[PDB]
RNA sequence: CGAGAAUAGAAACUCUUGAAGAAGUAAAUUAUCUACCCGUCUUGAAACACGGACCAAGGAGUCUAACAUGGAUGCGAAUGA
RNA sequence: AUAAACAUACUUUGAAUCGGCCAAGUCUGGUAAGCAGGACUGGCGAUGCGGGAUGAACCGAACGUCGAGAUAAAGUGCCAAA
RNA sequence: AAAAUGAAGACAUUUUAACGAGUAAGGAAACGAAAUGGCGUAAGGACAACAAAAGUAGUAAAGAUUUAAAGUAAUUUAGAU
């Protein structure tokens, strides 16, 4: 069972005038200038993030697997979603060592919990 | 560009009516104004003492207080974006009894005449009368026959041009 | 597009008990459920007044309750506000119900033989409201109200916040 | 274009309620016909729509729309100089058809749009009463001409092709 | 929905079904009647066009 | 329990029978009086229409201050919004001051039906709820003795005694788009334009707009 | 002929492709459509108006003192001490 | 007559602004101005989009992200959808 | 906005309807049916394997270069070097 995750825009909302200059980063900042080509929404360049682009509520923050993300740091965090293994999927944090990962990965098999980092920090 | 005089722009606003110069009537100083009456202010340029401001000429106001020689009259004056209440004291020569309620005060009499009959018909048991019908705008006329015995026809066509010189 | 007189914005009427008073958040839950179910205008009145700010919940001194309940022997005065004490005039026997009873007002009412109910005990006793006298204290007695407006005016002046070179 | 028969009467103090104003108006529909009729009363008899009532409004179909008649049209039009009167002759099988020609030629030769012409009277004249230099040559019995420099006629728009094969010739027809 | 909104729609649709057949019968009736007159009209030529050509 | 639904339907059937009598009996007397007047040589004056259906034609930009208020009192606050208007000396004058923004004629019973059945709506509790039953119409308009939808269509058509109460309850219909004019909408329909009075030629425009 | 009503009645399907990579997404190039230089003063700047060669770090409504309105809090003819 | 319950009446505190410009079935000074100064109204300012090839004001029409349809101004030889 | 439900579910609940352009400017924090919703940097007081060894870290921290995923967006998370 998986509802079709529908996206109203699959691109990135890059900052205006970030394709010419390097001091202007590619993170969105709405232009406040009076003569700006974009805040007036001129034709051809009228791409701004407006709340209408927001994706469906039912399938918001849902990974393509159909399961939401739940980060775990130790084996005892897995028990927090052992009842909801059909809704949440464990994702071992990036600081957990390569020894504690084999404890979490093996325990996630016992409780039958999908793990998104099953091939991370392998030998 | 005009001036700030009290009675500015009064060549035709204060001019007496044609062949109406001289004294006013004798019913001007004999009508009896009671508190609550609707009277019309009309500045009289023949009598300067107590001449109301030219912006109140023709406005309609309510008599609020009747003083021995002057009649208190209150009107609504418009300001920047609010309407204020103005309380003048105009001599009877400068005001005229307004008949704005001439129509209304004759509808009341018609209803009061009917209601007087309903207190007698009901006491004696007769079916009481119905109240007068309300006023409506000109309603769409219904369909009515036209006799073919007293009729006549006139053809209508665009007219041939006739020169005016 | 559509031409409207004015656009839809938030209605300036409150509907919850403000602040974080975990006990006032319960009366509104309790009286917001009695007004909805019973649909009694008394509960809607009580719920509405529990969600007003502090300056709109003026105090009712015990001598106001005394002169308002003179001709109401068996009644339960209901004032949604603090109830202070009027140390100049005596306090007869009466049953009151308020958000907060001042120490000397609570001891004086119960000394003469009265009762000092809270708002939970009133809903249990008379939920729809059967023997209540709704009361709310004066609102224009505040001192801040005097200074409002322009002092120079001809009809109703203000009171001229004092400062330098006052006279 | 259509022809309508419209009658109305005036009911007020100025006019007696026993006079009926007939009309035979030419208008594309029956609402542009009433407009022509009402303004014809008001500009000529001081009758306003608010003080009058429409009695009848019917179309007038042609009785014999299979016979060719010489129509004579009396009209007045407004130019940049003044106001003139014209009398043009037209050949058509319907009264509503010969008027439509009058608006097209007047709007072409004289460059006067249709809201300047007042059609006064349209009657039918005889064979010999056609004064038009061009219309006079076709009213005879023994009129014959060859329609020459023709263009081939296709059955419908279906057979028309953007590009053809072979040479193209006209027809003696 | 029409039945739900307008319960009279069942009565008024039944009439429009029966009236539909009535007009068909009216058409067929006058079809034969007018065809006969047309048939008789045809056989007034074929006689009165053989009493002009001869 | 739900045995009152069976009885309610019979009353709606009874009201539809009686409602169609007034419309049909008043139609016969108009035609009968037209035959007798032709035979006797008399003339007949058809009765003035009682209902006017107005459609907003233009947008919302560039409206004079007084005309803007008249359209609001007519509830034509949007383009392609059709409403039913009573005709008397006042609304006819009001509909004349705002002519460049409205086109209005007179609706036949076949047009009143299509608008109310297809684009009908009611204001219950402040929400423009589309018509989906008769229990919804009965609840909102029970006190006006309008319990079905053929009581709502009839009152609008004949302009009954409770027309104002019915008329404001119905929300202004939202209509589609269709060719309005031959030349353009900047000239009167008399000159082959878009606005102005269209009389019985408004039913043609409403047929492509519903 | 037949509305209401009473009683009886009927819906579970098929084919193609995909771990030899289906559907979706991303990157590069091509193709039709679209796209004047940002900040600012200005009624009006893409302007033949002014600053700007590029990058990194730093970079501008803060602190105290006095009054007032309002939101939360304690007590209340007292409050603060 | 018609419209009006997210109606109506407000109260307190406070920010920005008072260099304006255009259109006209209008006016004044001027020979006249893309000049100077006004009365009623709509706009540009603060505003994109479809059309006038381009255009701050003209015509249509005012904008959350889209899909399908009838439309408005205006067009249908090619560039250019018809 | 109005109804419904409401001690904890969860996605800031459920149903219906209307609406959404905008320079200057305003909408501080908390307020269960929330009197706008949030992202980021640094520092301080707490919480972070609840059966007496209790967040991560030499089985590789912070940082840097990229690749993928989530969020409309501020940004977050993860893989590899």
CSV table of C-alpha atoms in Angstrom, one decimal, chain C residues 22-86:
chain,number,residue,atom,x,y,z
C,22,UNK,CA,-3.6,25.5,33.5
C,23,UNK,CA,-6.7,26.0,35.7
C,24,UNK,CA,-8.3,28.7,33.5
C,25,UNK,CA,-7.6,26.5,30.5
C,26,UNK,CA,-9.9,23.9,32.2
C,27,UNK,CA,-12.9,26.1,33.0
C,28,UNK,CA,-13.0,27.2,29.3
C,29,UNK,CA,-12.8,23.5,28.4
C,30,UNK,CA,-15.5,22.8,30.9
C,31,UNK,CA,-17.7,25.8,30.0
C,32,UNK,CA,-16.9,25.5,26.3
C,33,UNK,CA,-18.5,22.0,26.5
C,34,UNK,CA,-21.5,23.0,28.6
C,35,UNK,CA,-22.4,25.9,26.3
C,36,UNK,CA,-22.1,23.7,23.2
C,37,UNK,CA,-24.2,20.8,24.6
C,38,UNK,CA,-26.8,22.4,26.8
C,39,UNK,CA,-26.9,25.4,24.4
C,40,UNK,CA,-27.9,27.6,27.3
C,41,UNK,CA,-27.2,31.3,27.0
C,42,UNK,CA,-25.9,31.5,30.5
C,43,UNK,CA,-23.0,29.1,29.7
C,44,UNK,CA,-22.2,31.0,26.5
C,45,UNK,CA,-22.2,34.2,28.6
C,46,UNK,CA,-19.9,32.6,31.2
C,47,UNK,CA,-17.6,31.1,28.6
C,48,UNK,CA,-17.4,34.4,26.7
C,49,UNK,CA,-16.3,36.4,29.8
C,50,UNK,CA,-13.7,33.9,30.9
C,51,UNK,CA,-11.7,34.6,27.7
C,52,UNK,CA,-11.3,38.4,28.3
C,53,UNK,CA,-8.1,40.1,29.2
C,54,UNK,CA,-7.3,41.3,32.7
C,55,UNK,CA,-8.3,45.0,32.1
C,56,UNK,CA,-11.7,43.7,30.9
C,57,UNK,CA,-12.4,41.7,34.1
C,58,UNK,CA,-12.9,44.4,36.7
C,59,UNK,CA,-13.2,43.6,40.3
C,60,UNK,CA,-16.5,43.6,42.2
C,61,UNK,CA,-16.2,44.8,45.8
C,62,UNK,CA,-18.3,43.0,48.4
C,63,UNK,CA,-20.4,46.2,49.0
C,64,UNK,CA,-21.5,46.0,45.4
C,65,UNK,CA,-22.6,42.4,45.8
C,66,UNK,CA,-24.4,43.5,49.0
C,67,UNK,CA,-26.5,46.3,47.3
C,68,UNK,CA,-27.2,44.2,44.2
C,69,UNK,CA,-28.4,41.1,46.1
C,70,UNK,CA,-30.5,43.0,48.7
C,71,UNK,CA,-33.7,41.9,47.0
C,72,UNK,CA,-32.4,38.4,46.1
C,73,UNK,CA,-32.3,36.4,49.2
C,74,UNK,CA,-31.7,32.8,47.9
C,75,UNK,CA,-29.5,33.5,44.9
C,76,UNK,CA,-25.9,32.7,43.9
C,77,UNK,CA,-24.1,35.8,42.6
C,78,UNK,CA,-21.9,35.0,39.7
C,79,UNK,CA,-19.1,37.5,38.9
C,80,UNK,CA,-16.4,36.4,36.5
C,81,UNK,CA,-13.6,38.5,38.1
C,82,UNK,CA,-11.8,39.0,41.4
C,83,UNK,CA,-14.0,39.9,44.4
C,84,UNK,CA,-12.3,42.4,46.7
C,85,UNK,CA,-13.4,43.7,50.1
C,86,UNK,CA,-15.0,47.0,50.9
